[model samples]
Target: MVSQKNGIATLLQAEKEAHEIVSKARKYRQDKLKQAKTDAAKEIDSYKIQKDKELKEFEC
Candidate 1:
């Protein structure tokens, strides 16, 4: 029937839209994870530099 065909077409379109939405969400999550890692690395490097400076001043 025509009604059945239309229902099937609607379902397919909804599924395609859901897939695109999920794909974008996954990429966004990955970007956030990368940013978190970069931030942690920067924090650790800053601490190390501060400690080295303290030690150098102590030696003097």
Candidate 2:
């Protein structure tokens, strides 16, 4: 029937929207994780530099 066809069309649209939302969420998570890793690396490098300076002071 025509009603059944409409129902199927609606379901397909809903499924397509859901897929788009999940894809966006996945990309957002990956971007955040990459940023976090970059920030952590910068922090570690800063700590190493600070420690090296202290070590040199002690040596002198």
Candidate 3:
């Protein structure tokens, strides 16, 4: 919210910017990983089910 100025405090400004940037980056990664992992697991599940069906056909 208070991202409009640096106010000449170079050290604190740099730290504050880095802090916000890394916090956002970490949150993005966390959410992305969660969604990606969920989708990947569901996809893999369907593929495994398809393989099972194929094996069942082979057995028959």
Candidate with the greatest TM-score versus the true structure: 2
The TM-score values for the models, in the order shown, are 0.68, 0.70, 0.61
lDDT of 3 by residue, 1-60 (tens): 655544567668778888999999999999999999999999999999999898889658
Instruction: Give lDDT per model, in order.
Output: 0.86, 0.86, 0.88
Question: At residue 27, what lDDT does model 1 achieve?
Answer: 92
Q: Lowest lDDT 10-mer window, candidate 3?
A: 1-10
lDDT of 1 by residue, 1-60 (tens): 334235857889867877999999999999999999999999999999999898889659
lDDT leader: 3
Candidate 2 structure quality by residue, lDDT tens digits, 1-60? 334235857889867877999999999999999999999999999999999898889658
In angstroms, the error of model 1 at 8 is 3.5
Please count the clashing residue pairs in each candidate, in the order shown: 0, 0, 0
Better of 2 and 3 by lDDT: 3
Candidate 3, lDDT over the whole model: 0.88
